[PDB]
Design an enzyme around this catalytic site. Structure first.
Site, PDB file in Angstrom:
ATOM      1  N   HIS A 168       0.828  -1.207   0.000  1.00 28.85           N
ATOM      2  CA  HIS A 168       0.000   0.000   0.000  1.00 28.85           C
ATOM      3  C   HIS A 168       0.867   1.263   0.000  1.00 28.85           C
ATOM      4  N   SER A 212       1.554  -0.253  -5.362  1.00 31.56           N
ATOM      5  CA  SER A 212       0.645  -0.524  -4.264  1.00 31.56           C
ATOM      6  C   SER A 212      -0.004  -1.896  -4.421  1.00 31.56           C
ATOM      7  N   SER A 234      -5.776   1.612  -1.701  1.00 32.02           N
ATOM      8  CA  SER A 234      -4.978   1.981  -0.538  1.00 32.02           C
ATOM      9  C   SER A 234      -3.898   3.051  -0.718  1.00 32.02           C
ATOM     10  N   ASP A 267       3.348  -7.844   0.203  1.00 33.47           N
ATOM     11  CA  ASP A 267       2.307  -7.712   1.228  1.00 33.47           C
ATOM     12  C   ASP A 267       1.002  -8.214   0.597  1.00 33.47           C
ATOM     13  N   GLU A 284       4.669  -9.433   4.265  1.00 30.31           N
ATOM     14  CA  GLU A 284       4.118  -8.520   5.260  1.00 30.31           C
ATOM     15  C   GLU A 284       2.909  -8.992   6.058  1.00 30.31           C
ATOM     16  N   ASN A 325       5.040 -11.027   8.901  1.00 34.15           N
ATOM     17  CA  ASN A 325       3.790 -10.915   9.636  1.00 34.15           C
ATOM     18  C   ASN A 325       3.838 -11.607  10.990  1.00 34.15           C
ATOM     19  N   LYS A 338       5.022  -7.690  15.387  1.00 41.08           N
ATOM     20  CA  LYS A 338       4.255  -7.300  14.226  1.00 41.08           C
ATOM     21  C   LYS A 338       2.788  -7.672  14.421  1.00 41.08           C
ATOM     22  N   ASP A 362       0.702  -4.531  15.025  1.00 50.34           N
ATOM     23  CA  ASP A 362       0.127  -4.049  13.762  1.00 50.34           C
ATOM     24  C   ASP A 362      -1.300  -4.568  13.645  1.00 50.34           C
ATOM     25  N   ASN A 363      -1.421  -5.872  13.452  1.00 54.68           N
ATOM     26  CA  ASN A 363      -2.722  -6.495  13.299  1.00 54.68           C
ATOM     27  C   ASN A 363      -3.720  -6.156  14.418  1.00 54.68           C
ATOM     28  N   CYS A 409      -5.217  -2.133  13.919  1.00 54.50           N
ATOM     29  CA  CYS A 409      -6.627  -2.180  13.517  1.00 54.50           C
ATOM     30  C   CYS A 409      -7.526  -1.654  14.618  1.00 54.50           C
ATOM     31  N   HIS A 429      -7.202  -8.763   4.057  1.00 49.36           N
ATOM     32  CA  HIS A 429      -6.359  -8.348   2.941  1.00 49.36           C
ATOM     33  C   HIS A 429      -7.044  -8.338   1.576  1.00 49.36           C
ATOM     34  N   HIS A 468      -3.211   2.162   9.336  1.00 49.58           N
ATOM     35  CA  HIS A 468      -2.692   2.255  10.684  1.00 49.58           C
ATOM     36  C   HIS A 468      -1.838   3.506  10.873  1.00 49.58           C
ATOM     37  N   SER A 496       6.302  -2.888  12.184  1.00 53.23           N
ATOM     38  CA  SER A 496       6.295  -3.808  11.059  1.00 53.23           C
ATOM     39  C   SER A 496       7.429  -3.496  10.095  1.00 53.23           C
ATOM     40  N   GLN A 503      10.536  -5.540   8.446  1.00 60.90           N
ATOM     41  CA  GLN A 503      10.654  -5.645   7.003  1.00 60.90           C
ATOM     42  C   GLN A 503      12.099  -5.316   6.590  1.00 60.90           C
TER      43      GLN A 503
HETATM   44  N1  LIG Z   1      -6.323  -4.105   6.859  1.00 60.74           N
HETATM   45  C1  LIG Z   1      -5.256  -4.163   7.796  1.00 60.74           C
HETATM   46  O1  LIG Z   1      -4.705  -3.157   8.320  1.00 60.74           O
HETATM   47  C2  LIG Z   1      -4.691  -5.616   8.223  1.00 60.74           C
HETATM   48  C3  LIG Z   1      -3.592  -5.782   9.185  1.00 60.74           C
HETATM   49  C4  LIG Z   1      -3.190  -7.191   9.447  1.00 60.74           C
HETATM   50  C5  LIG Z   1      -3.829  -8.286   8.809  1.00 60.74           C
HETATM   51  N2  LIG Z   1      -4.899  -7.981   7.884  1.00 60.74           N
HETATM   52  C6  LIG Z   1      -5.591  -9.151   7.211  1.00 60.74           C
HETATM   53  O2  LIG Z   1      -6.545  -9.645   8.167  1.00 60.74           O
HETATM   54  C7  LIG Z   1      -6.811 -11.111   7.911  1.00 60.74           C
HETATM   55  C8  LIG Z   1      -6.737 -12.075   9.046  1.00 60.74           C
HETATM   56  O3  LIG Z   1      -6.433 -11.714  10.443  1.00 60.74           O
HETATM   57  P1  LIG Z   1      -5.117 -12.081  11.399  1.00 60.74           P
HETATM   58  O4  LIG Z   1      -4.294 -11.487  10.322  1.00 60.74           O
HETATM   59  O5  LIG Z   1      -5.761 -11.374  12.463  1.00 60.74           O
HETATM   60  O6  LIG Z   1      -5.304 -13.793  11.357  1.00 60.74           O
HETATM   61  P2  LIG Z   1      -6.020 -15.126  12.157  1.00 60.74           P
HETATM   62  O7  LIG Z   1      -5.755 -14.213  13.288  1.00 60.74           O
HETATM   63  O8  LIG Z   1      -5.084 -15.806  11.165  1.00 60.74           O
HETATM   64  O9  LIG Z   1      -7.200 -14.528  11.278  1.00 60.74           O
HETATM   65  C9  LIG Z   1      -8.627 -14.952  11.075  1.00 60.74           C
HETATM   66  C10 LIG Z   1      -9.426 -15.511  12.137  1.00 60.74           C
HETATM   67  O10 LIG Z   1     -10.780 -15.799  11.550  1.00 60.74           O
HETATM   68  C11 LIG Z   1     -11.198 -17.067  11.835  1.00 60.74           C
HETATM   69  N3  LIG Z   1     -11.979 -17.538  10.695  1.00 60.74           N
HETATM   70  C12 LIG Z   1     -11.645 -18.134   9.469  1.00 60.74           C
HETATM   71  N4  LIG Z   1     -12.675 -18.428   8.679  1.00 60.74           N
HETATM   72  C13 LIG Z   1     -13.792 -18.027   9.356  1.00 60.74           C
HETATM   73  C14 LIG Z   1     -15.304 -18.088   8.998  1.00 60.74           C
HETATM   74  N5  LIG Z   1     -15.792 -18.564   7.889  1.00 60.74           N
HETATM   75  N6  LIG Z   1     -16.183 -17.541  10.021  1.00 60.74           N
HETATM   76  C15 LIG Z   1     -15.805 -17.015  11.212  1.00 60.74           C
HETATM   77  N7  LIG Z   1     -14.391 -16.948  11.575  1.00 60.74           N
HETATM   78  C16 LIG Z   1     -13.402 -17.477  10.610  1.00 60.74           C
HETATM   79  C17 LIG Z   1     -10.024 -17.967  12.253  1.00 60.74           C
HETATM   80  O11 LIG Z   1     -10.343 -19.024  13.051  1.00 60.74           O
HETATM   81  C18 LIG Z   1      -9.055 -16.903  12.815  1.00 60.74           C
HETATM   82  O12 LIG Z   1      -9.153 -16.770  14.288  1.00 60.74           O
HETATM   83  C19 LIG Z   1      -5.848 -11.381   6.667  1.00 60.74           C
HETATM   84  O13 LIG Z   1      -6.658 -11.259   5.549  1.00 60.74           O
HETATM   85  C20 LIG Z   1      -4.740 -10.338   6.793  1.00 60.74           C
HETATM   86  O14 LIG Z   1      -3.966 -10.246   5.646  1.00 60.74           O
HETATM   87  C21 LIG Z   1      -5.381  -6.662   7.551  1.00 60.74           C
HETATM   88  N1  LIG Z   2      -1.136   2.991   7.195  1.00 58.62           N
HETATM   89  C1  LIG Z   2      -0.596   1.890   6.713  1.00 58.62           C
HETATM   90  N2  LIG Z   2       0.442   2.035   5.853  1.00 58.62           N
HETATM   91  C2  LIG Z   2       1.031   0.951   5.328  1.00 58.62           C
HETATM   92  N3  LIG Z   2       0.716  -0.342   5.534  1.00 58.62           N
HETATM   93  C3  LIG Z   2      -0.441  -0.615   6.488  1.00 58.62           C
HETATM   94  C4  LIG Z   2      -1.122   0.532   7.080  1.00 58.62           C
HETATM   95  N4  LIG Z   2      -2.155   0.172   7.925  1.00 58.62           N
HETATM   96  C5  LIG Z   2      -2.043  -1.188   7.779  1.00 58.62           C
HETATM   97  N5  LIG Z   2      -1.084  -1.769   6.968  1.00 58.62           N
HETATM   98  C6  LIG Z   2      -0.595  -3.050   6.513  1.00 58.62           C
HETATM   99  C7  LIG Z   2      -1.626  -3.904   5.821  1.00 58.62           C
HETATM  100  F1  LIG Z   2      -2.441  -3.382   4.828  1.00 58.62           F
HETATM  101  C8  LIG Z   2      -1.704  -5.169   6.199  1.00 58.62           C
HETATM  102  C9  LIG Z   2      -2.603  -6.212   5.652  1.00 58.62           C
HETATM  103  O1  LIG Z   2      -2.383  -6.258   4.246  1.00 58.62           O
HETATM  104  C10 LIG Z   2      -0.696  -5.355   7.301  1.00 58.62           C
HETATM  105  O2  LIG Z   2      -0.471  -6.401   7.912  1.00 58.62           O
HETATM  106  C11 LIG Z   2       0.014  -4.027   7.554  1.00 58.62           C
HETATM  107  O3  LIG Z   2       1.429  -4.006   7.575  1.00 58.62           O
END
Ligand SMILES: NC(=O)c1ccc[n+]([C@@H]2O[C@H](COP(=O)([O-])OP(=O)(O)OC[C@H]3O[C@@H](n4cnc5c(N)ncnc54)[C@H](O)[C@@H]3O)[C@@H](O)[C@H]2O)c1
Ligand SMILES: Nc1ncnc2c1ncn2[C@@H]1C(F)=C(CO)C(=O)[C@H]1O
Ligand SMILES: NC(=O)c1ccc[n+]([C@@H]2O[C@H](COP(=O)([O-])OP(=O)(O)OC[C@H]3O[C@@H](n4cnc5c(N)ncnc54)[C@H](O)[C@@H]3O)[C@@H](O)[C@H]2O)c1
Ligand SMILES: NC(=O)c1ccc[n+]([C@@H]2O[C@H](COP(=O)([O-])OP(=O)(O)OC[C@H]3O[C@@H](n4cnc5c(N)ncnc54)[C@H](O)[C@@H]3O)[C@@H](O)[C@H]2O)c1
Ligand SMILES: NC(=O)c1ccc[n+]([C@@H]2O[C@H](COP(=O)([O-])OP(=O)(O)OC[C@H]3O[C@@H](n4cnc5c(N)ncnc54)[C@H](O)[C@@H]3O)[C@@H](O)[C@H]2O)c1
Ligand SMILES: Nc1ncnc2c1ncn2[C@@H]1C(F)=C(CO)C(=O)[C@H]1O
Ligand SMILES: Nc1ncnc2c1ncn2[C@@H]1C(F)=C(CO)C(=O)[C@H]1O
Ligand SMILES: Nc1ncnc2c1ncn2[C@@H]1C(F)=C(CO)C(=O)[C@H]1O
Lengths: 430, 431, 430, 431
Positions: free
Chosen positions: A53, A76, A81, A129, A154, A179, A184, A188-189, A193, A299, A351, A359, A363
């Site tokens: 991103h 990206s 993003s 990532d 990532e 990750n 991390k 991060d996660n 979030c 993701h 974030h 994170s 990296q």
């Molecule tokens: N947008 C962001 O800033 C960010 C940051 C980190 C990770 N992510 C993404 O978040 C996702 C997963 O979370 P984590 O990374 O917390 O991983 P876990 O902690 O690997 O993640 C998912 C959880 O959902 C549950 N699950 C799976 N299928 C399900 C269903 N059908 N119904 C109900 N629960 C279910 C699992 O048992 C598990 O506890 C990934 O897609 C990852 O890439 C996004």
């Molecule tokens: N502001 C931000 N800037 C860059 N990367 C970020 C940000 N917020 C969340 N992420 C990442 C992102 F998207 C995912 C999941 O794919 C991750 O696990 C993170 O590193």
């Protein structure tokens, strides 16, 4: 000929740079990494091609790699993003950046391909990532594989893919699971979030969390953060899970755990933190409450059946970029955010920079590892040494004015560990 | 031949004890589910388990679970003040060799542990320990029995820490199963358990108000995490000390101030040590503390608070009641010590509630059964239970809380590449 | 001449109208007011002049007043709180509105003055927020006083002014203290800022809250709300109070309570909720950590000494609208938000429409009471009957799907109260 | 004359009670500041105070405080289970007429109070009530003593409620002060007090796990708010019931689910009535509760739970221990009742901690002084204490918590239009 870059408006470089200056002072990890490994350029000769991103935080990472003698070309890892002012700042800096908020599936693919070959040779390092970059090279540019020294993933989804490829024998290049570094996924996660999800829903809908019933699919490190975030604002959160452990965790925390089939009839807000498909289907949208807000923070946009909405909704009005309001046959409405794409980055800024520093420092260390010590990382996904992990958190303590305690000799003896060396067993969960 | 059949404080308490056991049982589905599923099977038949764990109402239920599975058992508490008399009476009445009571002396302590070693027909077969006291006693003074023990199952973090140390030095001669480090244990018993028992032990002992006071929590591991939150939830400002950068970065991200004991000792009104390490609270700290500052430890061994200093330095030492001492220092200020440095939850209260303990005890039962029926699968060394079992301990408890788990569809199980029943997380998952 | 209105760009009306559609569905109170008094037109003949943050929520308000048969002319009670698309939507509907984000002191005054005289006579009522309108008239247009049937304040500072005015016998028109209505002060001030405060700090700076030390000046309804928000995100909150009761409350909640002279040395984030002047001065600025974020959430921008920063900082760069970053002689920097004006509305969207529905439902009731029953309210500041207060709260229960319990005949007689009439003694604090 | 000088469970408990009081006095700055300022002035000289309030450690310090101010007091508890024997002993040993003990019977309850009406020097002068039983006894049975009583003091909401209903009927023949509705009381004692005392009672009585359970708290008032927050702090899912739309919306904004007792009775694991009303939990409800559901009450009087119904319908009733009964209905399910419906925080524990109680009792001592020193300043009716006194009460507790209050500057105070010392808030402020 080829383009030196491709941003939405190079004119945003001014503002974007102002933002990078602010983010820098909030990311001591990446800065402490700069001043230390700058005069040495450990990444000299490296031609890093990253797919992440394009944000202000990523911009600080990109310049950090460069500060370390690394040559970089970026794109990206998501069509929504990118932060144009941040991308512009990097573009102005003379780095090949190919990203902009609102790319089409076509342009997205193109953007990554533009980072494959440098002015003097193809990529030899990967900073991914999601796994989109590695998948492209392993399936469309195999020729490059032997040329690529290592990889550093990532996120959870991307790392999930790596193991899959290694277990099937598809993975042909070493890779470090970034990750799953303690500093991390547990920051991060979780904390990342905890502050970014609400921001995405807020800028997009301005809805009041308090009083609303919010449904969170999945209780991983991401769902834990989301649930806590929503609860803290006064929302009653319900959880869905497939893992008995995670589910019992949510229950021990005072969260109601049920299936999506039941919960779809109660939620006023819906957030999917699962890393799998078919989480929210039409069977669900049909039972939802008027003007129910629906979004995904996972993701890949594979959790919410946005397709069903477009092919079944009577009306489809767009409120503003990344915000749509469908009208179903029943007469009730549905609010879709970022067309199902990770809402925190799609409707907000992702974030905050501080947690990202954690994170991104992991990296950077990872890049330095797959590039300086290839012998330590053969073909296969690996973890970063707990000694480095502890070091990452260590770099972020000062800013928070935290005073870490130091183990005395007697104490280090009693516990049988080095007052400097690691403090926890590799299996430790924190 | 004069070996007592048991040895409790008052057999008369068996009645009131049995009552508590019936209620607790209806809170521990894991164990009870283990009974109905393995009662007729009798997997622990022939096994003679010698345990050394806090004789509580929760432990009693575990002792009968082992017995319901055709296992011969002799018990002893692993801490002089943790035993619950009515609970020991109940078991003592059930015809099981019980040797424990609240208020044991160092002498009696070691004695009890030795009164469980030999069953009426042969030495012990398995070791169910909590802390390592039993495991170490045998390895050093009774090594002749080592080859006769099919395995050991450690309950807590300190005990498991000890095992590894022994294995490293190769001093460990009999197999062992790490129970504490089973997700459904460490991340539940250590966390949610202390979150409810700590305040309980402090409240029953001092009745002090938490709202408004400043509390210092040494260490921020799984036990510290739960203790900090408990205190915080009641309106107390919590400060954390730590040596691990990560753990410390965790407490900060949670709104906690993190500093050294040297500085926190001047602010604290309540002190709680959650470290498995020695020398946490010293005279240097006691002299700086505030008038009537409450001090207690919740770690396994009483090696965190230097009580010796308080005894050899206070101008006077009064006893308000059992396990509650109020020393007066030279500076005119007073200090309140709980359970003489011993783990406060069990020493001043009743330990973790029955529901949570079911988790850890169910892991304990699966360990015995595993280490007994499948010895040809556990070499000499410390191991973990398969995540399938760890996961099993969790699901067994979902019912009670009326939790409706979701089932992966065929398409989803494929997309994620995992069985809709098989393990859901990798071996490295941290939950 | 008299312009029919004046906004940033009426081309935003379409988007504003959409923002209202969503809002109307989040404010049951205001909507229940329309369907119940639409045909009745109780406010007929009333010429209401409003001076309150021209926002999406406030737009739904104005439209409600109109549906009840009142004529309305509007202006914002702050130079930065106006939401252009919401101001546009109102302008296109024929409702005279003079407000845009980014006004000047000269234009601020000018805007209010365009609402004094209507197409058919001087204003009848005064729906004010902060006292600017009621004060402007009492001092420059006293000849209009005898023609004004009533006033209805909105916020704490303003209601305070009213009391102060009555005491000195300057108030020449019956007013209703809306702010001190339970369904207002205990929801708007509290839950409102609890969501909007962080919202304003994030869109402006994107800083991570977790880990930071936040100093909240004051511990009133607003102070309470902000404080809870900050620590909910993992920030350590230090409080500063002058009232021992409020101070003990904070301490009983786990907050450290010292002076700003002390806290200015630890705060990474500063939020002033005090209702008075001189909270953060140069002496304080000189000691704040590098890049400390300082903002105000009080009605008037009199809590932060912004002038001092301008006349003493050795550097000042404008990151973006309402976001200034200064550099002091000591080298350390300070990020100021909204130039000291209420940040939640200046850097964001103010409170979400749901909680605002509570506040505005009282506003409408106040206008009806004052206009429909003039005699029942002599010159002075009054409260709304508790029966009316509970009515407001009960109107929003449906949306949250709350099941209120009905007292039985036996229970009611036991408690000595009506199962419909007031449920609490007049001095009840909730 | 055979009128015993006192009546307690065991005066031999005084030694321990005195210790408890030592620690308590060091946790009640307000109460100690009162005597530390009026010990010499003796403003209560000539007052024959008859107090009817939970004879506890905290209350002991309250009594000794009044005595230090020159008042003469005879005490009795306002509940048959709230009395703490060791505390009642200390006062007894100190030579103060106290008639109260834990486990009283209705007959003995009435008796205990009547033994506090006449002092050596004659009929009572002042009333310190909590619930209104004393004030109701005088007004109904001893109306000839009314003209001899200066003022009254209500501690709790229920009582205060009675004073209004009385004055309203013009049946109140003596000036009373509403101590409960004083900010430093209702917004601290009811809220923060229960937040720590409700669980304590539930725990000591049952040792149940709060985490993972579903709790139903009837009523969302100052007590309801406190109880709810405590329960969910431990991981319990709290469902709320209310009749007031405002309170109902408050709970909803806090993320609480608000339904009817008729529904919640089917999914609750723990029930807590915090209403001052009747018919909250009935047989129709019991019959729908989950097995082993813990039911209790924290409202002043035992009129919320139909305990009568349980005895007249359960097919089994087993007493686990004092104040803890377990029933079994015809549907085969069990129900755990605590303190037989009496306030559980005092019935199964030690009530609120000493710190917050100081806030309440400080206002109590303050009300007495006012009512006794300035009788003409209080006609016949019920009034609150001046706000400046409320602030003083809170301010007196800042010292111990180490709060650094801020002082308004000259300019500031002028701008705000208020003395940098005078009352800081308008009479209608709700905090
Ligand atoms: N947008 C962001 O800033 C960010 C940051 C980190 C990770 N992510 C993404 O978040 C996702 C997963 O979370 P984590 O990374 O917390 O991983 P876990 O902690 O690997 O993640 C998912 C959880 O959902 C549950 N699950 C799976 N299928 C399900 C269903 N059908 N119904 C109900 N629960 C279910 C699992 O048992 C598990 O506890 C990934 O897609 C990852 O890439 C996004
Ligand atoms: N502001 C931000 N800037 C860059 N990367 C970020 C940000 N917020 C969340 N992420 C990442 C992102 F998207 C995912 C999941 O794919 C991750 O696990 C993170 O590193
Ligand atoms: N009483 C109970 O109910 C109960 C339940 C489980 C565990 N325990 C005991 O709690 C202890 C440890 O906790 P965990 O939570 O089990 O393990 P970690 O989580 O292994 O425990 C200790 C934590 O303290 C930190 N630490 C170590 N030395 C320190 C020092 N000198 N100063 C400050 N911090 C220091 C570590 O970095 C680590 O985060 C053991 O003694 C264990 O047996 C008690
Ligand atoms: N921006 C918004 O959305 C919003 C919403 C409601 C109210 N407000 C404003 O917030 C302000 C006041 O808050 P409330 O919560 O309305 O009122 P209180 O609750 O009336 O407000 C202020 C509090 O600050 C304290 N205080 C006063 N001077 C102080 C000083 N010098 N140092 C430390 N503490 C001091 C008081 O003791 C009091 O508790 C007003 O200006 C009001 O108009 C803003
Ligand atoms: N045990 C203690 O330490 C303690 C301390 C303070 C007060 N109390 C007692 O708590 C009770 C009341 O609480 P407060 O907090 O004092 O007063 P409120 O705050 O006056 O109390 C009760 C609340 O319950 C609600 N309610 C009334 N009838 C109801 C019904 N049938 N169903 C559902 N909700 C209903 C009301 O709307 C109100 O919000 C009194 O009995 C009082 O004496 C006990
Ligand atoms: N009520 C209880 N009953 C039995 N065992 C308990 C209880 N509360 C805590 N524990 C155990 C205990 F002591 C330690 C650490 O040594 C653990 O890790 C726990 O399993
Ligand atoms: N989104 C919003 N829209 C309109 N008015 C709002 C909003 N958020 C807060 N307020 C008002 C505001 F500013 C103040 C203090 O002056 C109040 O007391 C509120 O009614
Ligand atoms: N430890 C305690 N000591 C004395 N009184 C207490 C305590 N805890 C609570 N209360 C009082 C009590 F019971 C009621 C309700 O009648 C109140 O309102 C309180 O003042």
């Amino acid at each position: 000929d080829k383009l030196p870059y491709k941003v939405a408006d190079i004119g945003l470089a001014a503002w974007g740079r102002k933002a990078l200056d602010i983010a820098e002072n909030e990311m001591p990890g990446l800065m402490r990494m700069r001043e230390r490994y700058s005069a040495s350029k450990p990444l000299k000769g490296a031609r890093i091609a990253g797919c992440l991103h394009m944000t202000v935080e990523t911009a600080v990472l990109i310049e950090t790699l460069v500060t370390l003698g690394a040559e970089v070309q970026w794109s990206s890892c998501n069509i929504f993003s990118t932060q144009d002012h941040a991308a512009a700042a990097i573009a102005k800096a003379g780095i090949p950046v190919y990203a902009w908020k609102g790319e089409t599936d076509e342009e997205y693919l193109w953007c990554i391909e533009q980072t494959l070959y440098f002015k003097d040779g193809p990529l030899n390092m990967i900073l991914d990532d999601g796994g989109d970059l590695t998948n492209l090279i392993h399936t469309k540019y195999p020729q490059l594989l032997p040329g690529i020294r290592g990889i550093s993933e990532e996120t959870t989804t991307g790392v999930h893919n790596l193991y899959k490829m290694m277990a099937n024998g598809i993975l042909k290049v070493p890779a470090i699971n970034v990750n799953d570094s303690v500093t991390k996924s547990k920051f991060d996660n979780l904390y990342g979030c905890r502050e970014s999800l609400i921001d995405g829903i807020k800028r997009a809908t301005d809805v009041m969390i308090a009083g609303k019933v919010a449904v969170v699919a999945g209780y991983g490190d991401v769902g834990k953060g989301c649930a806590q975030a929503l609860r803290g604002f006064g929302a009653r959160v319900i959880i869905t899970e497939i893992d008995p452990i995670n589910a019992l965790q949510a229950a021990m925390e005072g969260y109601e755990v049920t299936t999506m089939d039941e919960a779809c009839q109660e939620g006023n807000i819906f957030v999917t933190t699962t890393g799998c498909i078919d989480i929210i289907l039409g069977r669900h949208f049909e039972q939802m409450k008027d003007d129910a807000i629906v979004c995904n923070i996972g993701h890949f946009d594979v959790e919410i059946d946005v397709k069903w909405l477009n092919e079944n909704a009577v009306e489809k009005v767009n409120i503003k970029p990344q915000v749509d309001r469908y009208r179903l046959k029943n007469g009730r409405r549905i609010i879709l955010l970022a067309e199902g794409r990770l809402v925190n980055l799609g409707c907000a800024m992702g974030h905050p920079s501080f947690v990202m520093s954690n994170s991104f420092t992991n990296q950077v260390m990872a890049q330095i590892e797959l590039w300086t010590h290839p012998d330590k990382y053969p073909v296969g996904v690996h973890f970063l040494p707990k000694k480095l992990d502890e070091a990452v958190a260590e770099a972020h303590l000062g800013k928070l004015n935290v005073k870490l305690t130091k183990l005395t000799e007697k104490q280090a003896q009693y516990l049988g560990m080095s007052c400097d060396g690691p403090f926890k067993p590799d299996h430790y969960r924190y």
